[PDB]
Each structure stands twice: as structure tokens, then as C-alpha cells.
């Protein structure tokens, strides 16, 4: 159902150590698929998922050009924002851009988004109607006015509603095995004595895709007021994700506790228990 | 693909 094509753009000024660093990464859902980074001789857009490794030079020549154009404009906007805020050339600044389009279960445009940030804070946001912008301050208001005069919202909406959606379809086809054929969690419980009278039960979910998951501990098929340590979901490096959730329990009472796992890749939610 | 449209701030 809900799929998305998203880019994350980072540009960092390097005062008198060359032009700004510019990096652009592309994701479909939770899968990275391309990248451009202007630290090389020829910086080029390059595949970062196997299912792109068979795209021809029409794709890479265009996306290289487009990425270089993007870097250049970001150098311009970094200069411009330096002026607005009356900052010296000595200091390093960061400009970030995130945009994406989402599909609904009908395969059609459902929503788009686009945000700029300067030095790690909101600067300029495209509103939900993709027709207008919100500025955080006086400087961003100048940016709003320039975008109004230029019909930037119209241009971005055209990308988000048409082009973005068209390519997101193409990518979901090319990458079906990764993107549509999900990976359920391989799931297990480990047991770690803490003291003479209590142990940690740790519920592992491993090798799953996509990232979204729910891990829950139940005592007697009901909630508890117990110590419930949950780690941030983390990449395994292989395209999949890992998570665990731990509860500390009275030694001998481990069979009262059950781990509940929900993931889009499972036919049905799974439950789980420490197996001595 | 990337946006063909680049806002000037």
C-alpha cells in the first residue's frame, strides 16, 4: 500500500577548504538506492541498491547532471543565507533539503512534502496543500516571497504529484524483490541472570524489512509494571533491521512472560517465550 | 529521480 520516494540532501560550507560538501541520498521506503557525493574528481550519481545496478547511462548521465545542478544551487543558497543572517565567511554552515511523494493502496498520489533547514532547524516548509510556504523567521520570509514570485510551489508540486510518482512506480517494479516481498523478523528470546533472584528476558527481532515493528512483553497475557528496556531499531548492514525489548523478571517466573511481535512481513502477529 | 526544480532561497 503506502510506498514513498524520498531524497535527503546535505550541503556543508567549508570556508577556504574548497566549495561546500554536498551529499544526496535517495530512498524508496526504507531502502537506499542511489547516492551522489561531490568528494571525487568526477562526482557521479551511483547505484546503492543491487536492483539499480542494471540501469543504463541515460539514467546515470541525467541524474549526475541533476545532482551537480543541485549542489551548485545549494552553494548559492548557502551564500544567500549567510547574508540574510549576517554571518562571517569564517564559519561552517549546513543547509538540508528533504522531499518525498507517497502512494496510497490504490497506487496513486496520496501526499507530498518538502522542507528546508538551516544549521539544523526548520527554515522553510512547503505546506500540505503544496501551494504555499511557511517561514520560521524574517530571513525565511524573504525566501518565501522569492518562491511566491517564482511559482516554486507550482514547480515542486508538479515534481511531487507527477514525476516523483511515475518514477516511484518504476522503482517498485525494478526493486519488487526487496521492496514488495518483505522480510519477516526471525524472532527469539534470550535469558541473562542479573542477580541471584532476577533475570533479563530479551526479545530479539532480526533480519526484518521494513523498519517499522512492534515488540511487547506481557505478564499473564496482560500489561505489567516492570522494567521495559527498548533499543532503537538499527540497520544490520544487509538491508534489514534489528530490534530487541527486554524485561527483568523474578528468576523462576519466566514462563509468565510473553513477547508479542508485529511486523508487516508476518502473515499473523507472533508470540514468544523463553525456551530453556 | 531528483527534482528538476531547485528553489532559490
Amino acid at each position, epitope marked *: 500500500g503506502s510506498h514513498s520516494l524520498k531524497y535527503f540532501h546535505t550541503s556543508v560550507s567549508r570556508p577556504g577548504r574548497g566549495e561546500p560538501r554536498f551529499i544526496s541520498v535517495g530512498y524508496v521506503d526504507d531502502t537506499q538506492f542511489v547516492r551522489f557525493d561531490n568528494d571525487a574528481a568526477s562526482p557521479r550519481m551511483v547505484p546503492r541498491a543491487p536492483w539499480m545496478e542494471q540501469e543504463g547511462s541515460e539514467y546515470w548521465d*541525467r541524474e549526475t547532471r541533476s545532482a551537480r*545542478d543541485t549542489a551548485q*544551487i545549494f552553494r548559492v543558497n548557502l551564500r544567500t543565507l549567510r547574508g540574510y543572517y549576517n554571518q562571517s565567511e569564517a564559519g561552517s554552515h549546513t543547509l538540508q533539503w528533504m522531499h518525498g511523494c507517497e502512494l496510497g493502496p490504490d497506487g496513486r498520489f496520496l501526499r507530498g512534502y518538502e522542507q528546508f533547514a538551516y544549521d539544523g532547524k526548520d527554515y522553510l516548509t512547503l505546506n500540505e496543500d503544496l501551494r504555499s510556504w511557511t517561514a520560521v523567521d524574517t530571513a525565511a520570509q524573504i525566501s518565501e516571497q522569492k518562491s511566491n514570485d517564482a511559482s516554486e510551489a*507550482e514547480h515542486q508540486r*508538479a515534481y511531487l504529484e*507527477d514525476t516523483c510518482v511515475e518514477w516511484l512506480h518504476k522503482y517498485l517494479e525494478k526493486g519488487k524483490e526487496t521492496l514488495l516481498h518483505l522480510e519477516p523478523p526471525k524472532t527469539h528470546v534470550t535469558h541473562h541472570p542479573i542477580s541471584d533472584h532476577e533475570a533479563t528476558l530479551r526479545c530479539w527481532a532480526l533480519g526484518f524489512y521494513p523498519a517499522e515493528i512492534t515488540l511487547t512483553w506481557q505478564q499473564d497475557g496482560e500489561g505489567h509494571t516492570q522494567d521495559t528496556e527498548l533499543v532503537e531499531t538499527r540497520p544490520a548492514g544487509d538491508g534489514t533491521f534489528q530490534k530487541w525489548a527486554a524485561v527483568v523478571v523474578p528468576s523462576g517466573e519466566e514462563q509468565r512472560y510473553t513477547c508479542h511481535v508485529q511486523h508487516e512481513g508476518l502473515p499473523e502477529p507472533v508470540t514468544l517465550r523463553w525456551k530453556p | 529521480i531528483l527534482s*528538476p526544480f531547485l528553489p532559490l532561497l
Partner: T-cell receptor
Amino acid sequence: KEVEQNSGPLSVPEGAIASLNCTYSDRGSVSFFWYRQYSGKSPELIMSIYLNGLKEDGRFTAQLNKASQYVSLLIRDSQPSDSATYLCAVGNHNTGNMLTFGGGTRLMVKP
Amino acid sequence: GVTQTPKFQVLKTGQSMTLQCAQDMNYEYMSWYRQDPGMGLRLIHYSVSAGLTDQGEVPNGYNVSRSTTEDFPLRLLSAAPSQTSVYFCASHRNRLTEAFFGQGTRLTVVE
């Protein structure tokens, strides 16, 4: 020839609706323009369109259909000042060479 | 906003000639198109920003340079009758958005 317009000239009665069509060959096109050029003058932008659909401004309407790769302009209530050459231009994102122009269509508004 | 000079120009075969173009909008992109009678604009050369140039559809006979944002001169090396034409400079915010053209340069090359 990537951008196609009939040279014409086309005749329209004063007061009547004029319609102008433009096709383009590359599905990579992402931006579309109608320019008007008076004899011996420079192209002036009439309208711009980017989203698939209809777009209205005063007497002018444009239509973009990316599935069928055409753009069109409609001029309601044609006046003598609409007598000009109308230029179609597309931005082809696959080639990147700024705007590619059609050969133009001349419109004579006859009173 | 786009100041192109000169408006008219006659040249002898073999002469060289620089058309000037300046813009006050401080935009990155600048272009040179030519237009022969009854035809559309064809791109000669363009510049993505200060320091950079790129060929267009019909680069032959012509050089360009871009030291500054503001200016983008076109240079005929060795004038030929085929280069009798109207030349239009433009400025653009993005590669594929609205071209803002200058007033144009009508140029005839005579033996």
C-alpha cells in the same frame, strides 16, 4: 524535430476563440511554455504549465497532457493585439539543453 | 532586466563580432538562441553559472564566455551569410524554468 507546431498561418475572427496545439517527442519533458512574438520583437511569456491539466489566466487557457505529449493554448475573445507568432517551448529533463522551441505558429485575427 | 546590445548590426563576411548581454536578476543560467525567419529559436550555447559554458544545438561559428554572473557575450569568429539571423540572449532561474529574453540583435552578414 522535437517540438512540433503547424506554421500556419491560422485565421480567427475577431471575437472568436483561437486554439493552438503543440506536440513534443520526449516523455522526459517536465516544463512547458507558450511565448508570443510580435513581428520584429522578442518572445514574451504568455503562460507556463507544469502540472498535467488545465490552467487559466484571463483570456488564456492552457492544457497539458503528458500522457499524450501535447500542450495547447486557447485564446478567448480574440483581439487584434493577439495577432502574433505563438512559440511552444519545453524543458527536456533528459537532455538538459535549456528550453527547446517549436517552429512557431502565426495567428491572424481578422476583423 | 536583460540588456542585450546592439539592436542592429551589419558585418562583412569574415569579420568577427561580440554581442553583449547583461542581466540584473543575478540568476545562474544564461543562453543564446538564434531565429531565422519563419522558424523557431535554436539554442547556440548556454552557461549554467559563472565560469561554465556548454554547447547547444547549433554551436558552430560561435564562442561564449562567462566570467561574471551578470554577463554572457556571444562571439562570432568568422561571420558568414548563414549567420544572418536574429539573436536572443536570455536569463533563467533554473535549467528548465522560464527564459527571460533580451530585446534581440538583428544581424546581417554581407559579402
